[PDB]
Amino acid sequence: QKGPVFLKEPTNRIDFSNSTGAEIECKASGNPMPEIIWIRSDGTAVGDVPGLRQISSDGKLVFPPFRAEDYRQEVHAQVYACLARNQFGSIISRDVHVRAVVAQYYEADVNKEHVIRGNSAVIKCLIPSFVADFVEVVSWHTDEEENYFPGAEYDGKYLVLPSGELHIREVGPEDGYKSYQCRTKHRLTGETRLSATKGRLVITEPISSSAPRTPALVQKPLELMVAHTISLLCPAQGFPAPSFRWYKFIEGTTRKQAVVLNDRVKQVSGTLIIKDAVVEDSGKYLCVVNNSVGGESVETVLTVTAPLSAKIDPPTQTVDFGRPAVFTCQYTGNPIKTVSWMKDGKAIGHSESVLRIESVKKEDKGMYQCFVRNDRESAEASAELKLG
Amino acid sequence: AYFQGDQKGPVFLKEPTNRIDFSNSTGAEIECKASGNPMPEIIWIRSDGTAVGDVPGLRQISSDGKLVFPPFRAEDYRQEVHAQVYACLARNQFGSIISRDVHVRAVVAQYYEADVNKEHVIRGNSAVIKCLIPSFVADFVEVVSWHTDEEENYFPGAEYDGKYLVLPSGELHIREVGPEDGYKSYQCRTKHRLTGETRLSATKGRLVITEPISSSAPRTPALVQKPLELMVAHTISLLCPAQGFPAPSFRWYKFIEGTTRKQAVVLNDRVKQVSGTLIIKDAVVEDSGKYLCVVNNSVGGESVETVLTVTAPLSAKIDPPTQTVDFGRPAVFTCQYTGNPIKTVSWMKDGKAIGHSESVLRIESVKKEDKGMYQCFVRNDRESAEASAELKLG
Ligand SMILES: *[C@@H]1O[C@H](CO)[C@@H](O[C@@H]2O[C@H](CO)[C@@H](O)[C@H](O)[C@H]2NC(C)=O)[C@H](O)[C@H]1NC(C)=O
Numbered sequence: 001q002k003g004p005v006f007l008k009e010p011t012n013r014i015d016f017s018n019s020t021g022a023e024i025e026c027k028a029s030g031n032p033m034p035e036i037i038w039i040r041s042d043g044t045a046v047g048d049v050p051g052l053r054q055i056s057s058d059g060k061l062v063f064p065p066f067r068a069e070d071y072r073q074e075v076h077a078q079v080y081a082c083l084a085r086n087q088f089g090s091i092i093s094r095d096v097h098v099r100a101v102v103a104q105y106y107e108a109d110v111n112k113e114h115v116i117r118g119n120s121a122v123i124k125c126l127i128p129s130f131v132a133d134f135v136e137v138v139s140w141h142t143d144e145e146e147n148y149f150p151g152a153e154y155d156g157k158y159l160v161l162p163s164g165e166l167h168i169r170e171v172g173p174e175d176g177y178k179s180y181q182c183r184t185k186h187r188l189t190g191e192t193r194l195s196a197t198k199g200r201l202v203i204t205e206p207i208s209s210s211a212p213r214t215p216a217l218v219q220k221p222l223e224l225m226v227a228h229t230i231s232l233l234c235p236a237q238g239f240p241a242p243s244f245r246w247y248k249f250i251e252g253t254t255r256k257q258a259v260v261l262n263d264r265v266k267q268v269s270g271t272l273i274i275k276d277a278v279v280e281d282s283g284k285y286l287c288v289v290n291n292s293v294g295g296e297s298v299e300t301v302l303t304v305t306a307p308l309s310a311k312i313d314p315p316t317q318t319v320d321f322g323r324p325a326v327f328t329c330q331y332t333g334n335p336i337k338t339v340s341w342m343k344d345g346k347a348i349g350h351s352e353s354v355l356r357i358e359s360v361k362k363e364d365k366g367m368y369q370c371f372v373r374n375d376r377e378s379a380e381a382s383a384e385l386k387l388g
Numbered sequence: 389a390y391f392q393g394d395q396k397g398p399v400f401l402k403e404p405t406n407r408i409d410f411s412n413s414t415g416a417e418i419e420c421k422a423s424g425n426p427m428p429e430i431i432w433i434r435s436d437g438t439a440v441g442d443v444p445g446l447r448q449i450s451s452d453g454k455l456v457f458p459p460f461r462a463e464d465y466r467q468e469v470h471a472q473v474y475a476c477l478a479r480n481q482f483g484s485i486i487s488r489d490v491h492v493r494a495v496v497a498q499y500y501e502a503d504v505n506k507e508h509v510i511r512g513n514s515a516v517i518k519c520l521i522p523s524f525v526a527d528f529v530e531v532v533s534w535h536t537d538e539e540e541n542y543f544p545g546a547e548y549d550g551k552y553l554v555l556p557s558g559e560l561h562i563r564e565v566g567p568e569d570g571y572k573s574y575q576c577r578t579k580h581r582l583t584g585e586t587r588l589s590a591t592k593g594r595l596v597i598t599e600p601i602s603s604s605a606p607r608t609p610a611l612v613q614k615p616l617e618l619m620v621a622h623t624i625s626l627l628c629p630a631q632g633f634p635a636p637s638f639r640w641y642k643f644i645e646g647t648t649r650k651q652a653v654v655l656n657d658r659v660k661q662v663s664g665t666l667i668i669k670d671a672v673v674e675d676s677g678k679y680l681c682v683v684n685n686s687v688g689g690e691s692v693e694t695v696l697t698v699t700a701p702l703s704a705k706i707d708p709p710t711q712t713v714d715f716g717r718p719a720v721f722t723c724q725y726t727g728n729p730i731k732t733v734s735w736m737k738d739g740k741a742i743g744h745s746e747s748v749l750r751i752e753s754v755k756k757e758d759k760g761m762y763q764c765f766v767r768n769d770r771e772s773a774e775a776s777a778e779l780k781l782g
């Protein structure tokens with residue numbers, strides 16, 4: 001006899017268009033071979049909604065394409081999980097957050113950017129918050145028919161930044177005779193679109209000096225996957241045109257250290273570009289900006305995320321009554337907000353990485369699971385307790 | 389050739405203020421006035437320590453503590469005169485004292501324009517139309533009113549038709565946006581505090597309403613409000629921008645200082661909530677803290693932390709005024725400061741820094757050279773305050 005074990009866990013987030021639908025597969029092994037059950041993560045096994053959700057063979061949670069008119073929050077905006085069960089015990093998979101999106105019109109805008117002659121400028125493509133999870137910038141274009149793409153800086157002046165903005169170096173009066181528009185792509189429909197307004201730089205020739213001034217609204221804490229490229233903006237306008245330096249606070253201290261620039265880590269004006277993120281790049285960054293009148297600064301936190309995995313030591317044990325049983329969950333990833341245990345699909349209230357039963361009983365036989373979580377993600381491991 | 393009484397060190401009777409901001413057409417008078425026996429000399433220094441020269445037409449030191457910045461032509465701006473922190477230095481035979489810093493900022497009258505763009509919102513949600521003012525005039529310009537193409541006019545104060553509110557921060561708040569709400573275009577009126585000029589936005593904004601089919605948990609934006617410094621006694625509005633379908637609800641908490649624990653904000657007379665916006669009237673220092681907006685809906689939710697500091701004017705005071713001490717007996721000065729934040733304390737003796745940052749100063753054993761004036765300086769980011777005291781030999 002062997003308890004269930006997942007062979008294929010459903011992914012964590014599945015987002016899809018109503019025209020595309022969604023197959024989600026859950027595969028499990030055991031001896032006897034286990035039954036698969038889908039549940040809402042309110043605990044309840046899920047029904048079939050003809051046309052909308054059909055549990056199939058032998059995973060297998062299918063969402064067929066549907067009409068706007070048949071959208072249903074209860075089915076289509078939902079967190080699910082997979083439950084594999086046999087005589088020996090049950091295991092739950094991680095959560096599967098299901099988001100079906102009815103394909104709808106939107107439009108990105110580019111507005112006027114005001115800047116002091118000689119400063120760098122950042123033109124932003126405005127995307128409404130309710131498509132921003134799905135829409136991203138593919139390219140920039142001007143009325144003079146030039147086209148800018150992510151990659152390298154053009155003519156020492158134009159760079160399309162990782163976060164999709166257009167960065168322009170050393171803005172002069174001649175730069176006001178240009179109008180900019182972005183191209184956006186929606187990842188669920190694959191549709192692309194030119195922005196519905198276009199923006200211009202309005203340049204001031206200043207007479208007075210002015211210390212550097214940064215905006216009221218600042219980038220909130222970023223979460224970036226390992227091996228990805230990151231750009232941190234340091235918006236500032238000053239006269240004379242300022243200098244910019246970046247730091248990282250030593251983690252949990254009030255001290256900071258200059259960022260070192262190389263191959264991998266580059267600074268374009270005041271923008272820090274970090275290629276190939278490793279978890280160690282996480283931290284609290286400070287941009288200090290300066291000219292002969294004075295200085296200002298803004299902070300920006302970054303977490304470099306790494307995918308969770310867990311494994312319990314040992315994968316199985318046979319323990320006498322009422323001797324102790326000990327399970328140790330080992331995991332990998334960044335960040336780890338919590339560790340949680342289950343027994344035959346239910347919670348046990350125990351959030352330390354090591355589980356100890358002091359003296360085993362009849363009812364302790366079954367499957368145990370460690371779940372590790374951070375706010376975008378989860379990983380489970382399972383283990384088997386038998387009675388001597 | 390002459391004075392009576394014991395010599396008394398100098399002491400400021402009129403301290404110059406901290407920031408004077410002024411247009412090129414107005415100019416600036418800054419007055420420093422001090423006391424002592426005998427009767428002290430007044431010298432203006434730049435805040436690298438050097439005593440300042442006259443620049444005819446620009447900077448003239450006058451009778452009888454007065455630094456004067458006459459009205460001047462654009463062509464005549466000199467950053468060295470016009471963008472500068474000064475101090476007042478007052479001296480007599482007995483000793484010397486330096487005033488708190490005096491940040492001087494002359495600003496040449498220049499054209500700017502505000503803008504108001506398209507705002508995209510889910511029907512049924514609230515919306516916040518913003519007046520985009522250019523960073524480099526934003527210290528001097530702010531919103532005075534909102535106006536519509538159907539000729540309606542909204543002022544700071546009270547809600548209109550329970551629907552439109554001009555937030556104390558200048559944004560126009562609108563409740564429960566409906567499709568009919570897309571046939572309105574909005575402009576801001578802004579006022580420049582140094583020229584007193586008023587203008588309307590160069591561009592007008594509109595609402596673009598999405599009639600959504602799929603549900604969406606609440607979504608907050610990438611860029612969020614950085615830490616805010618509000619003067620005591622002022623009104624404050626904190627925003628929680630979020631769009632969601634259904635229409636989400638909003639709740640405000642405040643963290644217990646230096647813990648991970650929050651408490652619900654208690655809404656009443658003086659603290660109110662419009663949709664997701666928190667309004668704090670008549671701010672006290674105690675209102676300072678880390679605040680958290682939770683936002684919700686049957687699909688899931690989100691949140692935005694914002695830090696508020698309510699600031700209070702800094703003032704310092706030494707105990708005593710003056711003491712006489714025999715040689716090899718210790719002397720003791722204690723600074724009593726009020727205000728919010730204090731970031732730092734420091735000390736000087738006869739205009740020079742002594743490198744000592746604790747509220748109470750102690751000379752272990754008084755020598756000949758220790759006679760004279762001693763000063764505490766208490767500063768934050770935006771402000772400074774000084775105190776003085778007189779040490780005599782017995
Ligand atoms: C999913 O929803 C979309 C949007 O409601 C449907 O697409 C519409 O299809 C009609 C023709 O069938 C077009 O004329 C419209 O242009 C589409 N609307 C928009 C705004 O995109 C789509 O067919 C639905 N998918 C299904 C039923 O499989």
Ligand SMILES: *[C@@H]1O[C@H](CO)[C@@H](O[C@@H]2O[C@H](CO)[C@@H](O)[C@H](O)[C@H]2NC(C)=O)[C@H](O)[C@H]1NC(C)=O
Binds near residue numbers: 288289290295296297
């Ligand atoms: C560049 O600008 C910054 C102003 O933000 C200066 O850094 C500050 O320096 C003062 C002391 O002179 C400190 O008390 C502040 O805390 C500093 N801010 C921080 C934490 O960066 C800096 O002095 C300027 N560069 C120079 C040396 O001219």
Ligand SMILES: *[C@@H]1O[C@H](CO)[C@@H](O[C@@H]2O[C@H](CO)[C@@H](O)[C@H](O)[C@H]2NC(C)=O)[C@H](O)[C@H]1NC(C)=O
Binds near residue numbers: 460499
């Ligand atoms: C301060 O500078 C402003 C701008 O240069 C001056 O105002 C201008 O005055 C000229 C004539 O003197 C006019 O043609 C402009 O239309 C004005 N423009 C602005 C921007 O107001 C002002 O006179 C200066 N202060 C002085 C000379 O005392």
Ligand SMILES: *[C@@]1(*)O[C@H](CO)[C@@H](O[C@@H]2O[C@H](CO)[C@@H](O)[C@H](O)[C@H]2NC(C)=O)[C@H](O)[C@H]1NC(C)=O
Binds near residue numbers: 605684687688691
């Ligand atoms: C609409 O969204 C918000 C997002 O927070 C949800 O509120 C969460 O409330 C539960 C209460 O037990 C907490 O576990 C969460 O921690 C809250 N927020 C977070 C991320 O910490 C809520 O799920 C949504 N709908 C409602 C009202 O239930």
